[PDB]
Structure formats: C-alpha cells, structure tokens
C-alpha cells in the first residue's frame, strides 16, 4: 500500500500538470480574443458619434487585458513550479528506485517492474512542457502586436523560456535509460560479465515517448568513454567494440536494442576479474531552435577472455551491485569494502533461487554464516571481499566452493533440491544433534565442505548411536549413475556378511522409496 500511495500521489501531480497547461491554453485563447476586440475598438473609436462611453470602455478593456496578462503569466509560473516538483520526484525518487531494483534483479533478486508507468508519467510532463513552449511563443506574438509599460509578458518572457527549456532538457536527458543491461545471450543469468569474441546484447529506452521522435534518434555505443582508470590504473586494458555501434530508436516503447555487439582487446593492481569497464550511450535531439544532448551508461562490466573466469567475474558483479548504487565506481576493487552478512545471505539465497526453483533457508544460511564469520556470526558481521572469493578458508575459497555446488545441483540434482530432499548445508555438530536419537536407518543428504569440486554425501545413524558417512560423489560419479539410483543401490556389508542398504529413512522420517521413487531411472 505504501507503493500505491506514492503512485497515486504522483498520478495526481501529473494530472495537475496536464490540467494546468490546458487551462492556460484556454486562457490564452481568450486573451487573444480580448486583444483583437481591443484592437477593433481602438481603430473604430473615430466612427462612434456614443463617443464618451466608448472611450470609457476602452480604458476598462485595457485593464481587463492587463489583468488577464498578469493572470496567464502567474499560471505559467505556478505550472513550472509544479512541474519541477513532479519531475524531481519522477527522476530523483521513482527512477532512482527502479534502477536500484534493476541492480538487484541482475544479481538474482526480485523481478523488475515494467517501465510503462514511468513512461506514461514522463511523457505527459514532456507533452505539457512542449505545449508551454508553444504558449510562450504565442504570448510573444501578442506582445509584438501590443505592448505597454510594465507589460507582464515583457517582464517574464526571458525567465519563463529559460525555465521551460531547462526542465524539458532535464526530463528528456533523465528519461534516457539502459532498460536491459549488457548480457551474453548464451549466459542469460550472468549479466555484466562479458567474454571477448562472443555476442552480447544491450537495450536502451527513452521514457519520454513522443511520436515525433520515432525513427529520429540515433544512439551510438562507446567503450570506456571518460574512464580515467585507463590512465591512473597501471595495466588497464583497452577494448574495441566490433559490430554496429549505431542503432535508431523505434516504436509500444521508443527503444534501441543492440544485438551482435562484441569486445576485442587492443594490441597490475587490478586482476582481470576485478577490472571494471563501462558502456556509454549517446544521442542528440535536433530540431529547429532546439538541441539536446542525451547520454547514459550501463552498470560496470567485467570483461573476461575465458569461460573459466566467469564464476570469479560474477562474484565481482555481485559485490558491486550489492554494495554500490552508482553506475561508475570503476575503482571499486582497488579498496574493496566489506559486506554485512544480512546482505550477503540474501544474495546467496538469490543465487540458488535463480539457478533452481528453491532458495536457502535460515538453517542453511546460519551454517554458511559460521563458515564465513565463525561461532560469533551475527547479521551485522562484516565479510571482507578477500574472505568471500580470494583467501582459502581449508585449501579453497568460499565462493568457488558455493559455485561448484550450484553447478552440481543444476546439472545433476535439480529435482532433489527443488523438492526439499537435500539438507545440504549443516554443521557436523548439527548433523550429530539431529541424527542422534533417530531411527536406525536415518540418513541426510549434504554437500561436502572438504571438496573443492562440488560433491554430495549422505550420513546415516546406526545403533551401536554409531554414525556413518560415505565418500563424496562428484559430477563424474553422478554422470555415470544418477544419485537417486546411488541411494537406491547403495550397499554395506552387514554383520552377517550379506550386502545391505543402510539407507532406510530420509530425515525426519520418510521412506527412502517414497522420497526417491519418482527419480529412480528403472
């Protein structure tokens, strides 16, 4: 309802702007008519013979005209005052909030709202400002025909014109946005990480959708424009865009989609995966008596030469987007900041919920929180970038371990994870406390903390209670035989020297077959 309230308030302001410019149009029409009659009466005074009354009327008409000129000017000033407030809300609040929601969406957060509500608002205020500029030129025509000392039109014409242009320029400039961030179509859930020699796509949109602008604005893509790091950062790489750098905006939405774009290197405080670049977009509105430069940038992008570097590059996109709300902090990794657990936990859950149909619960995250922060884990605990992706927390880094787990789930364990069969992230002590006091064939599925590759293992309790675990299963084992088949056909030698399946009940208390029967190949 909070969102609705803001929306309805803006809708109201936009309606006020539209209505106000219509009122002025009607008032200006009446003003022209009064002036024309005033002109008539002044030229026909001689004919009247009835002369005194007519002379008195002429003075009254002047007064009415003066009052109406003052009234129209006052209304325009008020309209411009309302317009500024409304546009500032659209630009500095709503659109800023949409761009933030786009950052989150790129990194697995909740989906972006469609732009059409903001398009409607931006277009109405634009149409209104266009009309005002026409209204000011009509007023100037009236002034040219007739002007007096202390004429309101003469006194305010310069400022009213300057204000209106400044507002229109700001609104159309702000309406130029990156609707869809750069992304390789072959890696759709991995945006802002671009591989050299591969095709990528970016979409631009002008929120002010004016029919006259259709097919007229030509957008040019530039790589690393005004990037001081190419000078200040030693070893900074340089690239060129292959493919067409230009696209006309067309309508519905007035938009420009760049397909078939490609990056090629040119013939070290920052590593490749931490180096941040920018795509800039430029166009210009040119009309008789009207020129406006329009520019916008993408969010920072990481450029890689090998697919192997994609998980690391992704980690850097996640860090930036989670911690920064700016489009151009390209020196972010020179001195990277730390993240609170609360933010990281949400993002980590997002990773799972984007790749699979299931995210991470409090229990799984508490386990992970302890791996990063220790037994003292709090939601306000700070995790350094070096602890997330660079240092070996064991012989390996944390994000690489998490990633290899998500690729195992995607390629081999999707239905089990989605259905809730895998506990996955549980501490040894926690596993002990859940498993003990349970039935003799109780087991749980979880991921290995000692395996860099990404593995899965099961731990079962037995009455002497004794605990037992299996050597972990990597992708190689999973490719040959599915994991539900492994669970089904697992055998340990019993005390009677006969093979037996110790796996009887999935925690808390579910028959192996009921839980995994659906996934058995045979």
């Amino acid at each position: 309802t909070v969102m609705l309230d803001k929306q309805k308030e803006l809708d109201s302001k936009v309606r006020n702007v539209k209505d106000k410019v219509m009122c002025i149009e009607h008032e200006i029409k009446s003003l022209e008519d009064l002036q024309d009659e005033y002109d008539f009466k002044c030229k026909t005074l001689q004919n009247r013979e009835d002369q005194k009354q007519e002379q008195l009327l002429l003075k009254k008409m002047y007064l009415m005209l003066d009052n109406k000129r003052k009234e129209v000017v006052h209304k325009i000033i008020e309209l411009l005052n309302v317009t500024e407030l409304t546009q500032n809300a659209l630009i500095n609040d709503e659109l800023v909030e949409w761009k933030r929601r786009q950052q989150s969406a790129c990194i697995g957060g909740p989906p972006n709202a469609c732009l059409d509500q903001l398009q409607n608002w931006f277009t109405i205020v634009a149409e209104s400002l266009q009309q005002v500029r026409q209204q000011l030129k009509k007023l100037e025509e009236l002034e040219q025909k007739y002007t007096y000392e202390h004429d309101p039109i003469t006194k305010n014409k310069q400022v009213l014109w300057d204000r209106t242009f400044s507002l229109f320029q700001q609104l159309i400039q702000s309406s130029f946005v990156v609707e869809r961030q750069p992304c390789m179509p072959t890696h759709p859930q991995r945006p802002l990480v671009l591989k050299t020699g591969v095709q990528f796509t970016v979409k631009l949109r002008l929120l002010v959708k004016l029919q006259e602008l259709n097919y007229n604005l030509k957008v040019k893509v530039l790589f690393d424009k005004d990037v001081n790091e190419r000078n200040t950062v030693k070893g900074f790489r340089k690239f060129n865009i292959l493919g067409t750098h230009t696209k006309v905006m067309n309508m519905g939405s007035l938009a420009a989609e760049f397909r078939h774009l490609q990056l090629k290197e040119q013939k070290g405080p920052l590593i490749v995966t931490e180096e941040l670049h920018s795509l800039s977009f430029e166009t210009q509105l040119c009309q008789p008596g009207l020129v406006i430069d329009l520019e916008t940038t993408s969010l920072p992008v990481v450029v890689i030469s090998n697919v192997s570097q994609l998980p690391s590059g992704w980690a850097s996109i996640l860090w930036y987007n989670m911690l920064v709300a700016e489009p151009r902090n390209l020196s972010f990794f020179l001195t990277p900041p730390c993240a609170r657990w609360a933010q990281l936990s949400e993002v980590l859950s997002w990773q799972f919920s984007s790749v699979t149909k299931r995210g991470l619960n409090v229990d799984q995250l508490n386990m992970l929180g302890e791996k990063l922060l220790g037994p003292n884990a709090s939601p306000d605990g700070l995790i350094p970038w070096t602890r997330f992706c660079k240092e070996n927390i064991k012989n390996f880094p944390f994000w690489l371990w998490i990633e290899s787990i998500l690729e195992l789930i995607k390629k081999h364990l999707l239905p089990l994870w989605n259905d809730g069969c895998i506990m996955g992230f549980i501490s040894k002590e926690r596993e002990r406390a859940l498993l003990k006091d349970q039935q003799p064939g109780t087991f749980l599925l979880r991921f290995s903390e000692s395996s860099r590759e990404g593995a899965i293992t099961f731990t079962w309790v037995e009455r002497s209670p004794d605990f037992h675990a299996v050597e972990p299963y990597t992708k190689k084992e999973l490719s040959a035989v599915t994991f539900p088949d492994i669970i089904r056909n697992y055998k340990v030698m019993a005390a009677e020297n006969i093979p037996e399946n110790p796996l009887k009940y999935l925690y808390p208390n579910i028959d192996k077959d009921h839980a995994f029967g659906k996934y058995y190949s045979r």
Binding site: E429, R432, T459, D466, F467, H468, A469, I486, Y490, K491
Partner: peptide, 20 residues
C-alpha cells in the same frame, strides 16, 4: 568428541573421522 565411520562408494570401511 564423536566419531563417524567412513565407507566408500562400494561400501567398504575406509576409516573414521573425529570431531569436537
């Protein structure tokens, strides 16, 4: 302190691990 018995994919006992 508790111990968990480790079994390979075949089922053979591979040892035990100790935790605190």
């Amino acid at each position: 302190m508790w111990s968990v018995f480790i079994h390979g994919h075949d089922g053979s006992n591979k040892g035990s691990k100790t935790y605190t």
